[PDB]
């Protein structure tokens, strides 16, 4: 989870993606005003990580920063080529561009993972 290096394009930031994890550790019993706020804050973080890790897990990446998925690219989601996607468009810009096809992408990834799981058992007999 990184903030900083948001201005740079994909080609610059991806090299330092390693650094985002690399440099740092990365990522109440009171009814007073401050104490309740602390309880809510703790729950919010745990819940958020688990939602993120639950979404990551279903596609079978299992806690890895770059995950390759065998899902072909659909020309309805986007048109631009690799150079003009990874050379002059920031991550925020791209995620705003393809914000209408995240649900379908997630569903396709989950279905592909399930199909790959089924195809593995057959090989083992």
């Amino acid at each position: 989870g990184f903030l900083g290096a948001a201005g740079s394009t994909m080609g610059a930031a991806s090299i330092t993606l390693t650094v985002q994890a690399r440099q740092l550790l990365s990522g109440l019993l009171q009814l007073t005003v401050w104490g309740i706020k602390q309880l809510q804050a703790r729950v919010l973080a745990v819940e958020r990580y688990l939602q993120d890790q639950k979404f990551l897990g279903l596609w079978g990446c299992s806690g890895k920063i770059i995950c390759c998925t065998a899902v072909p690219w659909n020309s309805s989601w986007s048109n631009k080529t690799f150079e003009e996607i990874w050379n002059n468009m920031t991550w925020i810009e791209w995620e705003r561009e393809i914000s209408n096809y995240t649900s379908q992408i997630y569903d396709i990834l989950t279905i592909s993972q399930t199909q790959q799981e089924k195809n593995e058992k057959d090989l083992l007999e």
Partner: nanobody, 130 residues
Amino acid sequence: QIHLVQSGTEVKKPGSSVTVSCKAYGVNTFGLYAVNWVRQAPGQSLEYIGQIWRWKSSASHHFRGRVLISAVDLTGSSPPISSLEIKNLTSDDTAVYFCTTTSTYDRWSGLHHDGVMAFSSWGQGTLISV
């Protein structure tokens, strides 16, 4: 709410200059807003001239070197004002004009994209014929 008012109508002759100014009642500032100048046509579709966006003036490739755009935001007594000046006036300039604004506070809304945006609130318009 939001309301736009421009200047009055003018009848002129070629080889002159004329300016129309819109006064927006509802725009807190032009820093997080944007003004888009669009010229309707006598019978044709609407066209684009230019804009002021984060106090960075610009114009279309067919109006570069002629049209000028300036704007002043909230004052003590007056609301934000933006203006368009037509230089070297010609017969083809016989059309209505509009000053339009769309909000730019959130990136994720979908009313703007890298400076090329929609047109949310439209003024009444000022017919100009020569």
